[PDB]
């Protein structure tokens, strides 16, 4: 029998999960859940769409609910809410709130006897795994994480909420000189501004003051005041033509030394033409783990740090040992 | 209380473990065990050296025994032998024997209620993890593993067993063109001969026939006949001067696609100035896991596929969530 997946939220992430389920034949999409009236949400695979208030009635129809919502508002409620009725996966990515979200999700999942895996994706998720690995395998050394080149939704949206901006896309861009110094094993000390540049393409509103927009962008706290930021005004057509993708990538590098002074370097890198399609394929892999864990009577909140990779595969442990352990 | 480690075999690996223990303050090396008379084995940290026949008398003195022997003959007996009396880690790397070694070690570890983790290292080990990850995150695409540039002990030793060769060192070397094709997402079909070249430096015995040595090297089954192989005869002094390191490295790459055609690429790469120092730094990380698993009543044999990364850290699960989960 197939692992029965439900999706909450049908944004780029939910649409990404639906596509990943197409590539995971042990799985089937039973339902999509939305805040919206169902009738307004056109699901490509033509599965039933339903309102989230109905979801509790599907407790016995779904093995794993993959929560596709944002972290600022959707997850803080949805994580604990759905953990009461299903095993869940989410992409929660808010640094300062992780301990609280975890405790919250965990309390509900313990209560319900369900498995919740939070903060899955590539960062957090894959990259977090690699920060950890770097640090345990090479305890004397330094970890560097770089993001990009690619489109940051959050920074794009930040620019767009400026009055005077009609639309925008921002690229987060590792600065080469900084990545080469890391790669070449110099173990540099690097400030925020030395690691990433930011590059913005902006479509002005009628009557805007460019200089004022540029100024609000470059002096915005958190988003841009710590980085070299460039701004470029272009038309809507240009924004659609050249900046419609959601590529991204990055790398986690650990550079350390043996106790006899040998320079050792670990690098895990990603180069994605679709960020949300990637993130969502990870979500679905982890759903498999949540299921197998649930099936062995496990429960509670987990992160990627608690999940053995074998559980992510449909292949049996024997076949993994046979096929992938070496050569 | 420190985690109490014993080492069996004091070649490059065991000496690597000793160095890694210096970098892991939750650990202490209690004993080295050898086949040799102990008096012939000079341990740099001046820990006691003992004969392997003694080791059983040490079961209540050691938490984890890290087996540093070769896979061709030491491990196939040592794995099951020591798994009767301790938790063990090993680097078993013989593809075709893994299912049998696993079964053998597992039987003993189950019987004794001990935890054995086999085939740890960078390949197998880290790279195997990344083959697995690639494949579950990106189910539609291709995995490629390359090794080097670096010194392969096995191929060096194979050249040295030729009559007429006094000594040698061989380098396994990713062929650039093949790696670029993989990196650029072409998903090429690649033969053995297309992925790696082999490069040999050879110090002839007095009286040797160079042409004949060269011919035996290049037509040797398994080691060289499937590859473009070059041979270079040099002196002993040059071999000491320029070919004394044990560097190595490589990468595992998955190139896949979203169900909508987006090209996605995962790469995990290593660049090591000391292969054995690296491999042994991993063994010691995993020893930590073996101990935790032991302490929670777990038992039986494991591979890296069964070990959650969290268990490899000395930091609590809480501190890992806080610190490494993002940013």
UniProtKB/Swiss-Prot annotation, chains A, B:
CDD domains to which the protein is assigned, alphabetical: meso-DAPDH_N
Catalytic activity: meso-2,6-diaminopimelate + NADP(+) + H2O = (S)-2-amino-6-oxoheptanedioate + NH4(+) + NADPH + H(+)
Chain positions recorded as NADP(+) binding sites: 10-13, 34-36, 68-71, 91-93, 120-124
InterPro entries to which the protein is assigned, alphabetical: DapB_N (IPR000846), Diaminopimelate_DH_Ddh (IPR010190), Meso-DAP_DH_C (IPR032094), NAD(P)-bd_dom_sf (IPR036291)
Pathway annotation: Amino-acid biosynthesis; L-lysine biosynthesis via DAP pathway; DL-2,6-diaminopimelate from (S)-tetrahydrodipicolinate: step 1/1
Pfam families: DapB_N, DAPDH_C
Gene3D superfamilies: Dihydrodipicolinate Reductase, domain 2 (3.30.360.10), NAD(P)-binding Rossmann-like Domain (3.40.50.720)
Thermal properties of activity per the entry: Optimum temperature is 65 degrees Celsius. Thermostable. No activity is lost after 30 minutes incubation at temperatures below 60 degrees Celsius, while half of the activity is lost after 30 minutes incubation at 65 degrees Celsius.
Keywords: Amino-acid biosynthesis, Diaminopimelate biosynthesis, Lysine biosynthesis, NADP, Oxidoreductase
Enzyme Commission number(s): 1.4.1.16
Biological process terms in GO annotation: diaminopimelate biosynthetic process; lysine biosynthetic process via diaminopimelate
Biological role stated in the UniProt entry: Probably plays a role in lysine biosynthesis.
Summary of subunit composition and partner proteins: Homodimer.
The name this protein goes by in its record: Meso-diaminopimelate D-dehydrogenase
Native organism: Ureibacillus thermosphaericus
Top-level taxonomy: Bacteria, Bacillati, Bacillota, Bacilli, Bacillales
Gene from which this protein is expressed: ddh
């Amino acid at each position: 029998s197939k692992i029965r997946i439900g999706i909450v939220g049908y944004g780029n992430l939910g649409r990404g999960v639906e596509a990943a389920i197409q590539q995971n034949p042990d799985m089937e999409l039973v339902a999509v859940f939305t805040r919206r009236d169902p009738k307004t949400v056109a699901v490509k695979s033509n599965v039933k769409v339903l309102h989230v208030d109905d979801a509790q009635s599907y407790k016995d129809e779904i093995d794993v609910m993959i929560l596709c919502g944002g972290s600022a508002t959707d997850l803080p409620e949805q994580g604990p809410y759905f953990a009461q009725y299903f095993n869940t996966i989410d992409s929660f990515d808010t640094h300062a709130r992780i301990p609280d979200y975890f405790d919250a999700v965990n309390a509900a999942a313990e209560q319900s006897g369900k498995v919740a895996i939070i903060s899955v994706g590539w960062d957090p998720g894959l990259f977090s795994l690699n920060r950890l690995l770097g640090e345990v395998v090479l305890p004397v050394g330094n970890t560097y994480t770089f993001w990009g080149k690619g489109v940051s939704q959050g920074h794009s949206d930040a620019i767009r909420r400026i009055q005077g901006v009609k639309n925008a896309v921002q690229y987060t861009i590792p600065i080469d000189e900084a990545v080469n110094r890391v790669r070449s094993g110099e173990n540099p000390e690097l400030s925020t501004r030395e690691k990433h540049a930011r590059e913005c393409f902006v479509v002005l509103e009628e009557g805007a003051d460019p200089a004022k927009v540029e100024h609000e962008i470059k002096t915005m706290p958190n988003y841009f005041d710590e980085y070299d930021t460039t701004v470029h005004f272009i038309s809507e057509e240009e924004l659609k033509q050249n900046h419609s993708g959601m590529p991204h990538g990055g790398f986690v590098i650990r550079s350390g030394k043996s106790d006899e002074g040998h320079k050792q370097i670990i690098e895990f890198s990603l180069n994605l033409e679709s960020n949300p399609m990637f993130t969502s394929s990870a979500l679905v892999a982890y759903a498999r783990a949540a299921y197998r864990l649930s099936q062995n009577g496990d429960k509670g909140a987990k992160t990627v740090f608690d999940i053995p990779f074998g559980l992510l595969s449909p292949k049996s442990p024997e076949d993994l040992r046979k096929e992938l352990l070496t050569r």
